[PDB]
Enzyme design. Structure first.
Site, PDB file in Angstrom:
ATOM      1  N   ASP A  17      32.099 -30.555   0.963  1.00  0.00           N
ATOM      2  CA  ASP A  17      31.985 -29.256   0.597  1.00  0.00           C
ATOM      3  C   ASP A  17      32.948 -28.220   1.383  1.00  0.00           C
ATOM      4  O   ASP A  17      32.812 -27.265   1.814  1.00  0.00           O
ATOM      5  CB  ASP A  17      30.779 -28.626   0.640  1.00  0.00           C
ATOM      6  N   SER A  26      19.721 -21.464   2.018  1.00  0.00           N
ATOM      7  CA  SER A  26      19.942 -22.171   3.417  1.00  0.00           C
ATOM      8  C   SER A  26      18.691 -21.594   4.435  1.00  0.00           C
ATOM      9  O   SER A  26      18.649 -22.125   5.411  1.00  0.00           O
ATOM     10  CB  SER A  26      21.249 -22.398   3.937  1.00  0.00           C
ATOM     11  N   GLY A  27      18.294 -20.438   3.971  1.00  0.00           N
ATOM     12  CA  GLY A  27      17.273 -19.798   5.076  1.00  0.00           C
ATOM     13  C   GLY A  27      17.924 -18.491   5.518  1.00  0.00           C
ATOM     14  O   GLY A  27      18.879 -17.903   4.766  1.00  0.00           O
ATOM     15  N   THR A  28      17.582 -18.123   6.598  1.00  0.00           N
ATOM     16  CA  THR A  28      18.182 -16.671   7.368  1.00  0.00           C
ATOM     17  C   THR A  28      18.788 -16.905   8.517  1.00  0.00           C
ATOM     18  O   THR A  28      18.290 -17.852   9.431  1.00  0.00           O
ATOM     19  CB  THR A  28      16.866 -15.825   7.935  1.00  0.00           C
ATOM     20  N   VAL A  29      19.928 -16.456   8.823  1.00  0.00           N
ATOM     21  CA  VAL A  29      20.508 -16.442   9.988  1.00  0.00           C
ATOM     22  C   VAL A  29      20.393 -15.203  10.732  1.00  0.00           C
ATOM     23  O   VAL A  29      20.802 -13.878  10.193  1.00  0.00           O
ATOM     24  CB  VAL A  29      22.096 -16.713   9.775  1.00  0.00           C
ATOM     25  N   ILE A  32      21.994 -11.487   9.964  1.00  0.00           N
ATOM     26  CA  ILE A  32      23.267 -11.200   9.585  1.00  0.00           C
ATOM     27  C   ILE A  32      23.521 -12.092   8.320  1.00  0.00           C
ATOM     28  O   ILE A  32      24.647 -11.778   7.554  1.00  0.00           O
ATOM     29  CB  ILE A  32      24.577 -12.094  10.549  1.00  0.00           C
ATOM     30  N   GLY A  33      22.647 -12.684   7.738  1.00  0.00           N
ATOM     31  CA  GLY A  33      22.786 -13.405   6.349  1.00  0.00           C
ATOM     32  C   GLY A  33      21.280 -13.923   6.025  1.00  0.00           C
ATOM     33  O   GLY A  33      20.377 -14.216   6.893  1.00  0.00           O
ATOM     34  N   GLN A  34      21.116 -14.312   4.753  1.00  0.00           N
ATOM     35  CA  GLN A  34      19.822 -14.723   4.110  1.00  0.00           C
ATOM     36  C   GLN A  34      20.199 -15.289   2.642  1.00  0.00           C
ATOM     37  O   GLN A  34      20.677 -14.421   1.830  1.00  0.00           O
ATOM     38  CB  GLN A  34      18.880 -13.589   4.187  1.00  0.00           C
ATOM     39  N   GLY A  35      19.516 -16.373   2.422  1.00  0.00           N
ATOM     40  CA  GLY A  35      19.848 -17.050   1.261  1.00  0.00           C
ATOM     41  C   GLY A  35      18.871 -18.357   1.147  1.00  0.00           C
ATOM     42  O   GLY A  35      17.757 -18.528   1.593  1.00  0.00           O
TER      43      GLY A  35
END
Length: 294
Positions: A141, A33-36, A28-31
């Site tokens: 943050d 911080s890693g992959t979710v 559902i996401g990737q960047g």
């Protein structure tokens, strides 16, 4: 040291392979911080969010250990629940509760919140902040992206990748870790800030809820920080559209004088919060923003 980090993580995590415990994986996401992924807990049927990390491509592994340790020992209804962690070779897995209602960013960019809905969100966020600050944790943050929303209108704070643990010996910090647009002016003007930087950031988040964006969003981040330190308290585009009690609340969050700026404890008593609608009132905005973002 890479070896010291792996062993410390080994002591923290649950044993074994998480693939035995979770199924139905979907990215559902990737960047950075890693992959979710979303996944299903095989035992309880709980839908979870798993953050996967290859430790060979994490530059600041000290921060992830801190992240997990802070989450473990600072559980709260208004903090996204940390469930479990696993380490398989170089592969770290952090398992979190999944909130199917997206982020507050989706809501503020796709819908128009009323003051009752804003008061409810501010209240819930201040409940998380009071708890953190009373336990000597500064988030550092605070921004809509880090506020996750339940389909029932639950409001939960996350991302302890930037937090600071303080003591009476060292009650203040100097590192500039936060997202520029939400940063308190003292973070750039001096080299000593405390918990009330999160309160300033919450005030900026309230501006997001009003106007759809933090001030200076369109500016280069380098310019924005100069703009924050020199403009001080940001100006609303249409302050006359807001109730007097909401204007008062915002002013207490965005106060330049740190001593005069409200603490989380004090702000939970503010009368603006008393106009809060039930959290259920957020459900149509959450559904609308969900549909608008796919």
């Amino acid at each position: 040291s890479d070896e010291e980090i792996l062993e410390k993580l080994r002591s923290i995590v649950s044993v074994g392979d998480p693939k035995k415990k979770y199924t139905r994986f979907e990215k559902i996401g990737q960047g950075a911080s890693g992959t979710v992924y979303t996944a299903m807990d095989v035992a309880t049927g709980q839908e979870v969010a798993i953050r996967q990390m290859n430790l060979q491509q994490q530059p600041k592994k000290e921060l992830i250990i801190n992240e997990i340790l802070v989450m473990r020992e600072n559980k709260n209804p208004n903090i996204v629940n940390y469930l479990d962690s696993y380490l398989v070779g170089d592969e770290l897995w952090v398992v979190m509760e999944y909130l199917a209602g997206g982020s507050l960013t989706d809501v503020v960019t796709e819908t128009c919140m009323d003051e009752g809905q804003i008061a409810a969100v501010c209240r819930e966020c201040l409940q998380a902040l009071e708890f953190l600050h009373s336990n000597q944790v500064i988030h550092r943050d605070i921004k809509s992206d880090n506020i996750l929303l339940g389909m029932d209108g639950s409001v939960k704070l996350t991302d302890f990748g930037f937090c600071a643990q303080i003591t009476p010996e060292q009650s203040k910090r100097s590192t500039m870790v936060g997202t520029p647009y939400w940063m308190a002016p003292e973070v750039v003007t001096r080299k000593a800030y405390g918990p009330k930087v999160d309160i300033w950031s919450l005030g900026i988040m309230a501006i997001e809820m009003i106007e759809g964006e933090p001030p200076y969003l369109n500016e280069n981040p380098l310019r924005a920080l100069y703009l924050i330190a020199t403009n001080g308290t940001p100006e609303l585009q249409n302050p006359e559209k807001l109730s007097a009690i909401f204007r008062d609340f915002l002013n207490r969050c965005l106060e330049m004088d740190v001593e005069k700026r409200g603490s989380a404890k004090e702000l939970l008593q503010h009368q603006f919060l008393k106009i809060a609608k039930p959290l259920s009132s957020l459900t149509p905005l959450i559904a609308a923003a969900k549909e608008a973002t796919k």
